[PDB]
Design an enzyme around this catalytic site. Structure first.
Site, short mmCIF file in Angstrom:
data_model
loop_
_atom_site.label_atom_id
_atom_site.label_comp_id
_atom_site.label_asym_id
_atom_site.label_seq_id
_atom_site.Cartn_x
_atom_site.Cartn_y
_atom_site.Cartn_z
N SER A 126 -37.01 -11.40 -100.24
CA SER A 126 -37.77 -11.26 -101.48
C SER A 126 -38.97 -10.32 -101.35
O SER A 126 -39.39 -9.70 -102.33
CB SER A 126 -38.24 -12.64 -101.96
OG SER A 126 -39.03 -13.27 -100.99
N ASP B 40 -45.65 -11.08 -102.15
CA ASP B 40 -44.49 -11.87 -102.56
C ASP B 40 -44.77 -13.37 -102.49
O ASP B 40 -45.27 -13.86 -101.48
CB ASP B 40 -43.26 -11.51 -101.71
CG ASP B 40 -42.06 -12.41 -102.00
OD1 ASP B 40 -41.80 -12.70 -103.19
OD2 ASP B 40 -41.39 -12.82 -101.04
N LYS C 22 -37.83 -17.55 -88.26
CA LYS C 22 -36.81 -16.72 -88.89
C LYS C 22 -36.25 -15.67 -87.94
O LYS C 22 -35.41 -14.86 -88.34
CB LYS C 22 -37.36 -16.05 -90.15
CG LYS C 22 -37.84 -17.04 -91.20
CD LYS C 22 -38.41 -16.32 -92.41
CE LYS C 22 -39.05 -17.32 -93.37
NZ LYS C 22 -39.68 -16.65 -94.54
N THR D 36 -39.42 -14.95 -98.39
CA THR D 36 -39.11 -14.46 -97.05
C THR D 36 -39.25 -12.94 -96.94
O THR D 36 -38.75 -12.20 -97.79
CB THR D 36 -37.70 -14.89 -96.60
OG1 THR D 36 -37.68 -16.31 -96.40
CG2 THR D 36 -37.30 -14.20 -95.31
N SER E 93 -42.97 -15.34 -99.76
CA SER E 93 -43.43 -15.17 -98.38
C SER E 93 -44.85 -15.72 -98.19
O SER E 93 -45.57 -15.93 -99.15
CB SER E 93 -43.40 -13.70 -97.99
OG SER E 93 -42.12 -13.14 -98.23
N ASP F 71 -41.93 -13.36 -91.59
CA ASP F 71 -42.95 -14.32 -92.00
C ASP F 71 -42.43 -15.72 -91.67
O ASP F 71 -41.34 -15.86 -91.12
CB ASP F 71 -43.27 -14.19 -93.48
CG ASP F 71 -42.18 -14.74 -94.37
OD1 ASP F 71 -41.10 -14.10 -94.45
OD2 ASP F 71 -42.38 -15.82 -94.97
N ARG G 201 -42.80 -18.70 -93.92
CA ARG G 201 -42.75 -19.63 -95.05
C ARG G 201 -41.32 -19.97 -95.47
O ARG G 201 -40.49 -19.09 -95.65
CB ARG G 201 -43.51 -19.08 -96.26
CG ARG G 201 -43.34 -19.92 -97.53
CD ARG G 201 -44.05 -19.30 -98.72
NE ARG G 201 -45.50 -19.50 -98.67
CZ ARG G 201 -46.36 -18.97 -99.53
NH1 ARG G 201 -45.92 -18.19 -100.51
NH2 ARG G 201 -47.65 -19.21 -99.41
N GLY H 44 -32.09 -15.11 -96.92
CA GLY H 44 -30.98 -15.60 -97.71
C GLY H 44 -30.86 -17.11 -97.60
O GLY H 44 -31.87 -17.81 -97.51
#
Lengths: 245, 250, 220, 243, 244, 234, 233, 238
Positions: C129, C166, C33, C1, C169, C17, C19, C47
């Site tokens: 992340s 990442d 999100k 994320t 993500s 994002d 995912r 989280g």
């Protein structure tokens, strides 16, 4: 000024003319009590109590109507005695908790406000009855000055230069207004207190009595204390002699 | 406090609960409601007090509560109390279902509510529920069933009964016309139309004034249906055309 | 994320994002999100997903009650207080990492809120992340008092940095633009990611699956 | 919660609520019970025979356990409560103690319950009386009775409800070791007692019997009609050819 | 009906046969027992409170006799009626304000404070165990966008915003006066507002007060901190009225 | 006119307690006699029907092997106090491994005296006093003791005492015939005599109950035959 | 210190009446009148917001309150009680939304609020609310209009009136109004039925109006109400 | 009659009738007297018997080694208070390992007894107490009323016909502070005696004595242990 048709059985009930008669009756219980006065000058506060003796069997200093609420705060009561004691315990606990939570001696006005809110809490419900007593709180500090407050069964709290409660309230007040206490010292005041007490006392209706006297001021470094036997007897003598005129 | 307490859970000198009886009086002034048992079903028929030209009609009914997929009830008295009790009945049924994974027997449901009402009569200092109920249902133990409960938490099983305004007269009429073991849904419907026609103050009887529901058993499932106004009018017309038929003979 | 937020001249740009992963397996390619708080306040969530969902919904509800009673538009400080006090009360056991942004009578406001209940009021924030990549983009290309399209470009760039650097993500980019008199809930902004076209037809024809038992149930 | 004294003392030393409860009992359907040798029988009067009503749903004779049955008189709802509580306790006794239940034990439980309701804040006395009947291990047959006060006693035969005094008097005059020498004779005595206050029928009498380690037996109106028939016969073969 | 009673409808807060609440009305009467009257006026850029300061005894510390209270640095109130009840309600108001700021991060609006207090009073109105408070609260303060604000709450649970209000003995008369003086349409300035309130009270009781017989609270847009006027500035306002 | 259960009369008494005392005056009369050879307790059963099994009437119970109790008034109320007493003795045994003194048990039961009230109490608290008078008869280190307790909670030791409807007469009769050197036989005899005097029915073996506690023998309830042997010597 | 009266203040009379409820209804039938009309494509609520002085700021307290984005309320009877019920209704709506993530159906809100009202006719130490409620809502395409009374009972209306002269307003509605009306015409006849009582000059600040179509509930601006009160527009 | 039944109800004249009615419960009890020297504190109490075949009511109870009480009124309330006092004393010894000051115990009694004179459905304690003690400030006699009020007495008497005792004590106060134990108990016994008609007098059957002092823990004497005190009194004749 006298409505009693069920409208006076509970503190949770208004009278049709917008009154709470239970509180008035408690006040009346205060009115039937022996007189106690307190007066504030420029270096402290002095308390005087006409403690009626009901029997020669009772010891000297029984049924004190002068209390140490805190090391800097004294209390003078009039009315139903047990109630007065309970309120003294309440005041003490409030002061203690204030010290524990904030670190310093509780300001008198604040202690007054707190205890008075506690008293007011008993004038709202049918589950409890109003306190049958009125009381005065006295204190002295260099950072606040000399302070004297009074609280009645309704929960009302005011600051005074001179105050009295009990039987001879108004007479005592008339005697008090003759003093210029804003310029006198507690020393000079004790005599005048004892004097006003001896004046206001009714030796015909009420038999023998005992005089209680309390210091709190610059002379005592802020500690509320009892008046020494010396100064007490001096003031009493001054009073008895002033009574013959 | 002791002064204002009306003392609601207290025996009277003759050994009775005044608030329960007064509640029964409240029930007596409510919409007439009756129920009749048959061999191929069971039915509720009730007077509609919500009959005004400006009512919007957004519900399936007015006095017919579905309690369970195999059980329904009708009510008489104060309606809000009825909403409370009906909600609780649904709760009870679902609790039984969660516990045993099978439908609650009707009698158990009725008893479960009646213990609550009784509890209200015995302690708490509250007024009782000004409500009587009629329960119709089916179960694998006693088949088709009709029950009745009063605000005292007292209940009974019936083959036919009535509740609400002019209940006694309706009961007498039912005692006359009923047919133990020889009852059908059609005949019972006729009987309902008859008794309702005589007991209701407002004569002629429009479908705007009555509410009928039947509970029947079709193909292993239980079916509960509220009669459409058309069917009701068919029944009423049938009643009048039978009444004008027996009056010719003189 | 990877979620981010920035403060520009006329308001606030939020980015996220799309995912959602369970372990190291992508479960959702199009997760939302960016959460509604109030008509003028929005919140990106990283989280523990369920915790961000319930926290953000609860606060949205309480804020609707609040504005309904006050008759005024909610303030961002209010959302921040409610969130941070609720979260502190639970001592980090509610895994909500949030980017809270909105526009008030006092203007635009952007807070980052950590699951333990600490907050930071900053012109630009990142969580998740992929937060370090996005933060790199910000620390390199952020200037105060940007214009709308510039801010949108910056945020989308940061979210992209996260997406491509990442493993937590990926997929699309969602933006939410909040100004003193406009709300652009662009979803999604731009999908820089695509599944390659199927080279084959693995279509199974009727009858290829053996059946032991059938039962048709007519409805209504 | 509701914390008010309902049951209090009167200046003359009476518990008025308990007395009113006893009145409520006095308005109840008549219930009688007699104890035999290997049989015990209980019979209840007016079943409020509406005929449009399911009898099964309005029986005033319940079973507490396989060992103990019971009749009652008063407020049916209160009776339902007390009955179910008694049932729970009957099972809890089996849990806490491997042995089943004695009649006196469950009688004591019910009695204590009522007394508790005569002395607790907020609560109201149960307006019922109960006839408890059973066979204990060791085979001794027993009949007890309780009261809204909490008092309880053992009897050889008794009645409660409307016109309990009349049936009690009848039972006082008729209970012998000759009567209730056979099951069919004890049941006969019960029906005879009940018909002395009931509206004279047989369709208005419910009768249940317990015997030995066997279960409670409820009598169908055919058998009841037969017994009332032999009754009317003996009431015309020993009373007709005499007076 | 028309004044009918049944049961305890004159003792506790239950309905009379015509659907009145006698105890509440009695509380309204209990307000006047203080024998005082308070005036509250809203200006174009301010809000002003004024109240009689009856100190019949020199044995009192005037400094402790006040019906003006600070609820917040920017929210002031005046209380009318039973004293102890008034102070209780003041404490409650202060608590609700502090708690509000603690939970929501911004200063409480007068609107919501008054609504809160009224909501609390309604409970006393609907529960039998306690009796309404024989007091009346008038709040003043500057809101962020709506300008100056004067609100007031009842022992009945009613609350409302006003251009001007009053409480106590001379309530109806003060209302009549003020509603007469509002229709004129004049430059509601700071001095105009202060003078309007003072003269309302004065004419309604007829006094031409000493500067020690009343007390004046005030709040301005330029200075939102609730300020209680010294006797000096009060007199400065007094002498200006004896010119025209 | 309804007042609280904890209201004082202008005389300085609790209405409920006094009314309970009144409620005792309807109870079956009971007699206890203390003697250096033991303590005896006798009470009439008051059978109201031949159909009532009299063996199911116990107005004399065992608190413990060395303490018995005779009750008068509302028996239902008495059962609670009896159970509480038994539990108390057993707890004392458990904790200290020694029997309770009669005075200690009596005091324990007396602690449940004015433990009634409406407001400011548990939801399982008593609403009214116990309408019952008790006579505890026991044997301990101080020998044979006999105590009396009333709904006031006041308990006192007694040499010979009568409770119940015919309390006054029986007490006078007891006074005329008691001295601190009687035999147990004389005590039982006297008790049965006065009982027969005050009882409305004819005294017989299935009409009263009698129990003794002697220093050498645990609490004993007299059998029918044992009663017959005594009634024989009228 | 305080606890609470645990007994009912509302009890059955020997006639079988719940007297306090009927006295509450008496309190309702003494308050300012209110009208509600369901009109095919929308719902109208209107009430007499007549102050007692020019000093009253009518832009501070409202009688037509929103419960959510699609449900509105008006009342007849006591104000404070209504305010309580409004808070409670809003709370209930939000609980429903938290559990179902779907705007609360009007009928469900009505049922829950009605349950709350019923509580205060049986629970201890309290009197019933002196308020009748009119609740409008848009859910599942259709429009909705309910009324809830102090007993806790509720009814669905096509149109109705409460408060002073509610009987004559009701008859007026029964004659001078029916279905297939657009919301505009409904507002018109609503102000018309309120005018059958509003003693005095009915201004744009003397009454309050709220609407509920499938775009949400909202209070009408004083300007819009002026345009409608021009006996036109 | 409407200000009679609840302690939470003031009368229109500033009185609480339930408290006073409670005070009346003290007078229904047998008389008791308490006096102190400068070294000793003595309670003397007239026991009392129902019938001749009943023992005489306990009047003196032990609280702590330095504190004992004499009761007058409802015995249940007396035992209640007694247990309270005992527990407080035990608490004090447990925490501070020093005996609890008498005046403080009394103050605690006042606090505890005041509470139910202000709560609805609660009643005052229907019992008066005389408390004999000895601490760092010497001997002490205290008096507690149902009004929750308390008094530090030089001597006192409460109960039925206790006015006589009150008078006698009021005469011989100046003697007490210098009396010896025998003389003190004597005076107490005479005070108790003046509370009787000329027909009846003190016995080893209807008198209980309680003594505490600088050289003596609180002790109770009755039956034959009272005889040494009585056999030393002047046969006061009518």
């Amino acid at each position: 000024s006298s409505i009693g048709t069920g409208y006076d059985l509970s503190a949770s009930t208004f009278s049709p003319d917008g009154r709470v008669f239970q509180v008035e009756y408690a006040m009346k219980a205060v009115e039937n009590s022996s007189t106690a006065i307190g007066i504030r000058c420029k270096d402290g506060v002095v308390f005087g109590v006409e403690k009626l003796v009901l029997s020669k069997l009772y010891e000297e200093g029984s049924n004190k109507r002068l209390f140490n609420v805190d090391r800097h705060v004294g209390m003078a009561v009039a009315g139903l005695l047990a109630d007065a004691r309970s309120l003294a315990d309440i005041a003490r606990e409030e002061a203690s908790n204030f010290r524990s939570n904030f670190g310093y001696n509780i300001p008198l006005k604040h202690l007054a406000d707190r205890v008075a809110m506690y008293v007011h809490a008993y004038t709202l419900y049918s589950a409890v009855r109003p306190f049958g007593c009125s009381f005065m709180l006295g204190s002295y500090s260099v950072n606040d000055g000399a302070q004297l407050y009074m609280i009645d069964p309704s929960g009302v709290s005011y600051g005074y230069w001179g105050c009295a409660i009990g039987k001879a309230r108004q007479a005592a007040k008339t005697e008090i207004e003759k003093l210029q206490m804003k310029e006198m010292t507690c020393r000079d005041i004790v005599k005048e207190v004892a004097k006003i007490i001896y004046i206001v006392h009714d030796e015909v209706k009420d038999k023998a009595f005992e005089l209680e006297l309390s210091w709190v001021g610059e002379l005592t470094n802020g500690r509320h204390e009892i008046v020494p036997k010396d100064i007490r007897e001096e003031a009493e003598k001054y009073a008895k002699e002033s009574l013959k005129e | 406090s002791r002064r204002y307490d009306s003392r609601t859970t207290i025996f009277s000198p003759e050994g009775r609960l005044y608030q329960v009886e007064y509640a029964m009086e409240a029930i007596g002034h409510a919409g007439t409601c009756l129920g009749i048992l048959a061999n191929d079903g069971v039915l509720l028929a009730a007077e509609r007090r919500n009959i005004h030209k400006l009512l919007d009609e957004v519900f399936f009914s007015e006095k017919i509560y579905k309690l369970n997929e195999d059980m329904a009830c009708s009510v008489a008295g104060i309606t809000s109390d009825a909403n409370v009790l009906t909600n609780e009945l649904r709760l009870i049924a679902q609790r039984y279902l969660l516990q045993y994974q099978e439908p609650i027997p009707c009698e158990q449901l009725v008893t479960a509510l009646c213990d609550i009402k009784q509890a209200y009569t015995q302690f708490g200092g509250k007024r009782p529920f000004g409500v009587s109920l009629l329960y119709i249902g089916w179960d694998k133990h006693y088949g088709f069933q009709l029950y009745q409960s009063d605000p005292s938490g007292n209940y009974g099983g019936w083959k036919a009964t009535c509740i609400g305004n002019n209940s006694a007269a309706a009961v007498s009429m039912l005692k006359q016309d009923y047919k133990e073991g020889e009852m059908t849904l059609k005949s019972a419907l006729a009987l309902a139309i008859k008794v309702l026609n005589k007991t209701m103050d407002v004569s002629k009887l429009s479908a705007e004034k009555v509410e009928i529901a039947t509970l029947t058993r079709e193909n292993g499932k239980t079916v509960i249906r509220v009669l459409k106004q058309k069917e009701v009018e068919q029944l009423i017309k049938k009643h009048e055309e039978e009444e004008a038929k027996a009056e010719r003979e003189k | 994320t990877t979620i981010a937020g920035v403060v520009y001249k006329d308001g606030i740009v939020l980015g996220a994002d799309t995912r959602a992963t369970e372990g190291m397996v992508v479960a959702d390619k199009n997760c939302s999100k960016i959460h509604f708080i109030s008509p003028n306040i929005y919140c990106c969530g990283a989280g523990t997903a369920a915790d961000t969902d319930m926290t953000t919904q609860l606060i949205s509800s309480n804020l609707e009650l609040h504005s309904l009673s006050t008759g005024r538009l909610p303030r961002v400080v209010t959302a921040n207080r409610m969130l941070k006090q609720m979260l502190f009360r639970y001592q980090g056991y509610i895994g909500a990492a949030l980017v809270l942004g909105g526009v008030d009578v006092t203007g635009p406001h952007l807070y980052s809120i950590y699951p333990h209940g600490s907050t930071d009021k900053l012109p630009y924030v990142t969580m998740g992340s992929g937060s370090l990549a996005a933060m790199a983009v910000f620390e390199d290309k952020f200037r105060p008092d940007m214009e709308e399209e510039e801010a949108k470009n910056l945020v989308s760039e940061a979210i992209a940095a996260g997406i491509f650097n990442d493993l937590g993500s990926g997929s699309n980019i969602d933006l939410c633009v909040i100004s003193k008199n406009k709300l652009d809930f662009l979803r999604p902004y731009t999908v820089p990611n695509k599944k390659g076209t199927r080279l084959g037809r693995y279509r199974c024809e009727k009858g290829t699956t053996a059946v032991l038992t059938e039962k048709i149930t007519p409805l209504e | 919660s509701y914390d008010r004294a309902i049951t209090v003392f009167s200046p003359d030393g009476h518990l008025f609520q308990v007395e009113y409860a006893q009145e409520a009992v006095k308005k109840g359907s008549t219930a009688v019970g007699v104890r035999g040798r290997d049989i015990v029988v209980l019979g209840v009067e007016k079943k409020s025979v509406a005929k449009l009503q399911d009898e099964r749903t309005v029986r005033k004779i319940c079973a507490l356990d396989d060992n103990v049955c019971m009749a009652f008189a008063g407020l049916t709802a209160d009776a339902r409560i007390v009955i179910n509580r008694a049932r729970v306790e009957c099972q809890s006794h089996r849990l806490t103690v491997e042995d089943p239940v004695t009649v006196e034990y469950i009688t004591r439980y019910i009695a204590s319950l009522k007394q508790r309701y005569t002395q607790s804040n907020g609560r109201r006395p149960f307006g019922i009386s109960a006839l408890i009947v059973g066979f204990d291990f060791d085979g001794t047959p027993r009949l007890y009775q309780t009261d809204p006060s909490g008092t309880y006693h053992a009897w050889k035969a008794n009645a409660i409800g409307r016109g309990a005094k009349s049936v009690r008097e009848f039972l006082e005059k008729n209970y012998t070791d000759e009567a209730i020498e056979t099951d069919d004779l004890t049941i006969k005595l019960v029906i005879k007692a009940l018909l002395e206050v009931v509206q004279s029928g047989g369709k208005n009498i419910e009768l249940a019997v317990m015997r030995r380690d066997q279960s409670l037996k409820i009598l169908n109106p055919e058998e009841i009609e037969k017994y009332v028939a032999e009754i009317e016969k003996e009431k015309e073969e020993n009373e007709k050819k005499k007076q | 009906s028309r004044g009918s009673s049944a049961g305890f409808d004159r003792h506790i807060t239950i309905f009379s046969p015509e659907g009145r609440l006698y105890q509440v009305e009695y509380a309204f009467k209990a307000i006047n027992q203080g024998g005082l009257t308070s005036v509250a006026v809203r200006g174009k850029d301010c809000a002003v409170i004024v109240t009689q300061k009856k100190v019949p005894d020199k044995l009192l510390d005037s400094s402790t006799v006040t019906h003006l209270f600070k609820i917040t640095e920017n929210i002031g109130c005046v209380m009318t009626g039973m004293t102890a009840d008034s102070r209780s309600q003041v404490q409650r108001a202060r608590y609700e304000a502090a708690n509000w700021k603690y939970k929501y991060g911004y200063e409480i609006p007068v609107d919501m404070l008054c609504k809160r207090i009224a909501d609390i009073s309604q409970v006393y109105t609907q529960n039998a165990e306690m009796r309404p408070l024989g007091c009346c609260m008038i709040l003043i303060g500057i809101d962020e966008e709506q300008g100056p604000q004067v609100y007031k709450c009842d022992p009945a649970g009613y609350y409302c915003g006003f251009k001007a209000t009053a409480a106590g003995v001379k309530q109806t008369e003060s209302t009549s006066f003020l509603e007469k003086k509002v229709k004129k349409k004049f430059d509601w300035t700071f001095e105009q507002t202060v003078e309007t309130a003072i003269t309302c009270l004065s004419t309604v009781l007829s006094i031409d007060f000493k500067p020690s017989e009343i007390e004046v609270g005030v709040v301005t847009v330029e200075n939102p901190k609730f300020r209680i006027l010294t006797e000096a500035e009060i007199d400065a306002h007094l002498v200006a009225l004896a010119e025209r | 006119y309804d007042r609280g259960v904890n209201t004082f009369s202008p005389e300085g008494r609790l209405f409920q307690v006094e009314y309970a005392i009144e409620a005792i005056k309807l109870g079956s009369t009971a007699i206890g006699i203390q003697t250096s050879e033991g303590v005896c307790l006798a009470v009439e059963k008051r059978i109201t029907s031949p159909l009532m099994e009299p063996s199911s009437i116990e107005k004399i119970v065992e608190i413990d092997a060395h303490i018995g109790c005779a009750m008068s008034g509302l028996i239902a109320d008495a059962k609670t106090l009896i159970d509480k007493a038994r539990v108390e003795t057993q707890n004392h045994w458990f904790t200290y491994n020694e029997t309770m003194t009669v005075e200690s048990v009596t005091q324990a039961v007396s602690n449940l005296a004015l433990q009634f009230g409406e407001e400011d109490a548990d939801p399982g608290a008593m609403s009214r006093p116990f309408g019952v008078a008790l006579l505890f008869g026991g044997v301990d280190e101080k020998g044979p003791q006999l105590f009396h307790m009333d709904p006031s909670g006041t308990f006192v030791q007694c040499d010979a005492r009568a409770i119940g409807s015919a309390s006054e007469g029986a007490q006078s009769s007891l006074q005329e015939v008691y001295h601190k050197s009687m035999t147990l036989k004389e005590a039982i005899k006297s008790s049965l005599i006065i009982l027969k005097q005050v009882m409305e029915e004819k005294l017989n073996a299935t009409n009263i109950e009698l129990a003794t506690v002697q220093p050498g023998q645990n609490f004993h309830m007299f059998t029918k035959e044992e009663l017959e042997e005594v009634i024989k010597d009228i | 210190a305080e606890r609470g009266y645990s007994f009912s203040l509302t009890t059955f009379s020997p006639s079988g009446k719940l007297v306090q409820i009927e006295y509450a209804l008496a309190a309702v039938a003494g308050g300012a009148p209110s009208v509600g009309i369901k009109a095919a494509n929308g719902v109208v609520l209107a009430t007499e917001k007549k102050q007692k002085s020019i000093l009253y700021d009518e832009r501070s307290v409202h009688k037509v309150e929103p419960i959510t984005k699609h449900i509105g309320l008006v009342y007849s009877g006591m104000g404070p009680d209504y305010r309580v019920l409004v808070h409670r209704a809003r709370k209930l709506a939000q609980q429903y939304y938290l559990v179902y993530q779907e705007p609360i159906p009007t009928a469900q809100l009505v049922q829950r609020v009605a349950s709350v009202m019923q509580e205060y006719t049986q629970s201890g130490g309290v009197r019933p609310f002196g308020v009748s409620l009119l609740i409008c809502g848009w859910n599942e395409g259709r429009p909705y209009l309910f009324q809830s009374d102090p007993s806790g009972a509720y009814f669905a209306w096509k149109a109705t009136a409460m408060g002073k002269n509610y009987v004559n307003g009701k008859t007026f509605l029964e004659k001078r109004y029916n279905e297939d009306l657009e919301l505009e015409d409904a507002i018109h006849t609503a102000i018309l039925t309120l005018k059958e009582s509003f003693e005095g000059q009915m201004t744009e600040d003397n009454i309050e109006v709220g609407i509920c179509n499938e775009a949400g509930f909202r209070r009408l601006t004083p300007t819009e109400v002026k345009d409608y009160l021009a006996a036109i527009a | 009659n409407q200000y009679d039944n609840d302690v939470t109800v003031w009368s229109p004249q500033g009185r609480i009738h339930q408290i006073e009615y409670a005070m009346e419960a003290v007078k229904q009890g047998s008389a008791t007297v308490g006096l102190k020297s400068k070294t000793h504190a003595v309670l003397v109490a007239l026991k009392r018997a129902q019938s001749e075949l009943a023992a005489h009511q306990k009047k003196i109870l032990h609280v702590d080694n330095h504190i004992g009480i004499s009761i007058a009124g409802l015995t249940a309330d007396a035992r209640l208070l007694c247990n309270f006092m005992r527990q407080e004393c035990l608490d004090s010894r447990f925490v501070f390992d020093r005996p609890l000051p008498v005046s403080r115990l009394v103050s605690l009694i006042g606090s505890k007894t005041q509470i139910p004179t202000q709560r609805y459905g609660r009643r005052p304690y229907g019992v008066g107490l005389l408390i004999a003690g000895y601490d760092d400030m010497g001997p002490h006699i205290f008096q507690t009323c149902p009004s929750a009020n308390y008094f530090d007495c030089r001597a006192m008497s409460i109960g039925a016909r206790s006015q006589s005792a009150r008078t006698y004590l009021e005469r011989h106060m100046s003697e007490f502070m210098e009396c010896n134990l025998n003389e003190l108990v004597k005076h107490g016994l005479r005070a108790l005696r003046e509370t009787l008609p000329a027909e009846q007098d003190l016995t080893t059957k209807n008198v209980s004595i309680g003594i505490v002092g600088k050289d003596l823990e609180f002790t109770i004497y009755d039956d034959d242990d009272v005889s040494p005190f009585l056999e030393g009194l002047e046969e006061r004749p009518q």
